[PDB]
Amino acid sequence: TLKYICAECSSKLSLSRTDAVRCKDCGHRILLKARTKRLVQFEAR
Amino acid sequence: SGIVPTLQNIVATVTLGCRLDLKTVALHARNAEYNPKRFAAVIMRIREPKTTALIFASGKMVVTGAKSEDDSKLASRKYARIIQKIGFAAKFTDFKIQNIVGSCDVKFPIRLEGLAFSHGTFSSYEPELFPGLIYRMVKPKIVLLIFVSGKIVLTGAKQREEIYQAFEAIYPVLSEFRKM
Amino acid sequence: PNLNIVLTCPECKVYPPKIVERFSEGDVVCALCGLVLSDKLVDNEVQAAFAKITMLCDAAELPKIVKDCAKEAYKLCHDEKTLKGKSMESIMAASILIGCRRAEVARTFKEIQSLIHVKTKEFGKTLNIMKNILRGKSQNLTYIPRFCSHLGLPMQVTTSAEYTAKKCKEIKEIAGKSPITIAVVSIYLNILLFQIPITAAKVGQTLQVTEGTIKSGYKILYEHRDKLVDP
Amino acid sequence: RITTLDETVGVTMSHTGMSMRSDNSNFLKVMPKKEIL
Ligand SMILES: [Zn+2]
Ligand SMILES: [Zn+2]
């Protein structure tokens, strides 16, 4: 499974496939994709 | 296992061979009903074997309510004798059993939804419409009504062995979908 | 008769085609010798039925996906022998309820029965034969939130009701006597747990369940209050 | 003026769509042969 976030309560979900799309603990159907864990690099230029 | 289905109702047809005057029949029979406006047949009954006959003007007769094939033929001959006694040139012919109904109890609850999913092409289950699962067996061609309680109804048989055959065939399936 | 074109490298010839296609250059090239394979890559009854069906699903506010599943279904049935009748009212309701099922949406037999008068039992037979045809051409839970809507109940109430339905089905005992009674009773329990009044007659009216039925379900459900508690 | 219904909005919609509630009102609910002859 893959980790997501709720729209409002910002709770961590990590719902799996074939769970459709909804938050547990509230009805918001807007799920954020929960930013990547691995490191990202920039040049200050 | 150990369970064998109990026969509950046998339906048969008989050709009397002559036309009948229904008012006459209804009038002379000891236990008859006849209201032309509701149904076109005299509904006659006898006490032994306890059965009901639907008697038509064409001379055809339907006999139902018997619990055994013996009782069916017996009661049929009896109805024919009554018609004779009333005065028509009736003959007891073409006795044929058209439908046999049986039932039993497997003694455990069944998961109807699982069974319906697994045996989908033979099953029909709409619990809001009717609480039992309708199972249409291919060989033998018998219809079974399966209930959550474990009570089973088998119907559509022309011969007793078909009732017995179907149950033997369904038992393993009912076991696979038990609740306790 | 033949007419199928395949792309093959006359210089390679080793494999069948293994190539890449370059959309920007609009050309297609063998990935091996780097040769260009191609260039200049270019960039009466029914209609009446679907019309009235369209009206029905529309008045029902069902999302187009459901509408179109039912349309598809109905096309398959169409003029076939086995149907042998039903006057076009039974088929439209059947196909609808199908498309609902297949769409994972749920609608009660009563609801559709409110959009169309099908006489009931006749409807069941038609629905079953249609179901058989679909197999030949080869779940209460959803109802629970929908009902809350009708009552406008909080989310926690709804999820509580869901836990209640799963727990009740496992514990068996009356097997449900159709799902509708269980869904409504499950709610009635969950709400009575909480302080929010609907009382009883209001839910029996509103959701069209016999008050006696709700109370009867309530006694047995009350007996198993022990194991139904989520927290 | 016009009045805004303030309810939970769920009840109103339930009545709108298929409600499982029907009827409750009616409007456009729509001598023998020898002597005899
Ligand atoms: Zn949330
Ligand atoms: Zn090449």
Curated annotation (Swiss-Prot), chain A:
GO MF annotations, alphabetized: DNA binding; DNA-directed RNA polymerase activity; zinc ion binding
The keyword Lyase appears for this protein: no
Parts of the chain that traverse the membrane: none
Gene Ontology BP annotations: nucleolar large rRNA transcription by RNA polymerase I; ribosome biogenesis; RNA-templated transcription; termination of RNA polymerase I transcription; termination of RNA polymerase III transcription; transcription by RNA polymerase I; transcription by RNA polymerase II; transcription by RNA polymerase III
Annotated disulfide bonds: none
Description of post-translational modifications: The N-terminus is blocked.
Protein name from the UniProt record: DNA-directed RNA polymerases I, II, and III subunit RPABC4
Source organism of this protein record: Saccharomyces cerevisiae (strain ATCC 204508 / S288c) (Baker's yeast)
From Swiss-Prot, chain B:
Coiled-coil region(s): none
Sequence repeat placement: 7-83, 97-174
Keyword Ribosomal protein: no
MF-aspect GO terms: chromatin binding; disordered domain specific binding; DNA binding, bending; DNA-binding transcription factor binding; RNA polymerase I general transcription initiation factor binding; RNA polymerase II core promoter sequence-specific DNA binding; RNA polymerase II general transcription initiation factor activity; RNA polymerase II-specific DNA-binding transcription factor binding
One cellular component (GO) term of this entry: transcription factor TFIIIB complex
Chief subcellular location: nucleus
Keywords: DNA-binding, Nucleus, Repeat, Transcription
Gene Ontology terms: biological process: DNA-templated transcription initiation; negative regulation of DNA-templated transcription; nucleolar large rRNA transcription by RNA polymerase I; positive regulation of transcription by RNA polymerase II; regulation of transcription by RNA polymerase III; RNA polymerase I preinitiation complex assembly; RNA polymerase II preinitiation complex assembly; RNA polymerase III preinitiation complex assembly
Localization per Swiss-Prot or TrEMBL: Nucleus
Family: Belongs to the TBP family.
Subunit description: Binds DNA as monomer. The 1.2 MDa TFIID complex is composed of TATA binding protein (TBP) and the 14 TBP-associated factors. One copy of each TAF1, TAF2, TAF3, TAF7, TAF8, TAF11, TAF13, two copies of each TAF4, TAF5, TAF6, TAF9, TAF10, TAF12, and three copies of TAF14. Interacts with TFC8.
Protein name, as recorded: TATA-box-binding protein
From Swiss-Prot, chain C:
Spans traversing the lipid bilayer: none
A Gene Ontology BP annotation from the UniProt entry: transcription open complex formation at RNA polymerase II promoter
Gene3D superfamilies: 1.10.472.170, Cyclin-like
InterPro entries, A to Z: Cyclin-like_dom, Cyclin-like_sf, TFIIB, TFIIB_CS, TFIIB_cyclin, Znf_TFIIB
Cross-referenced PROSITE patterns: TFIIB (PS00782), ZF_TFIIB (PS51134)
Sequence repeats: 56-132, 147-223
GO CC annotation: nucleus; transcription preinitiation complex
Keywords tagged on the record: Metal-binding, Nucleus, Repeat, Transcription, Transcription regulation, Zinc, Zinc-finger
Zinc finger (TFIIB-type): 5-38
Keyword Metal-binding tagged: yes
Binding-site residues for Zn(2+), renumbered to this chain: C9, C12, C30, C33
Miscellaneous section: Present with 6750 molecules/cell in log phase SD medium.
Function field: General factor that plays a major role in the activation of eukaryotic genes transcribed by RNA polymerase II.
Subunit architecture: Associates with TFIID-IIA (DA complex) to form TFIID-IIA-IIB (DAB-complex) which is then recognized by polymerase II.
Family: Belongs to the TFIIB family.
The name this protein goes by in its record: Transcription initiation factor IIB
Species, as recorded: Saccharomyces cerevisiae (strain ATCC 204508 / S288c) (Baker's yeast)
Curated annotation (Swiss-Prot), chain D:
Top-level taxon: Eukaryota
Compartment(s) where it occurs, according to its Swiss-Prot or TrEMBL record: Nucleus
Family membership: Belongs to the TFIIF beta subunit family.
Function recorded in the entry: TFIIF is a general transcription initiation factor that binds to RNA polymerase II. Its functions include the recruitment of RNA polymerase II to the promoter bound DNA-TBP-TFIIB complex, decreasing the affinity of RNA polymerase II for non-specific DNA, allowing for the subsequent recruitment of TFIIE and TFIIH, and facilitating RNA polymerase II elongation.
Record text on subunit structure and interactions: TFIIF is composed of three different subunits: TFG1/RAP74, TFG2/RAP30 and TAF14.
Additional remark text: Present with 520 molecules/cell in log phase SD medium.
Name of the protein in its database record: Transcription initiation factor IIF subunit beta
Protein species of origin: Saccharomyces cerevisiae (strain ATCC 204508 / S288c)
Source species taxonomy: Eukaryota, Fungi, Dikarya, Ascomycota, Saccharomycotina
Range covered out of full length: 251 to 300 of 400
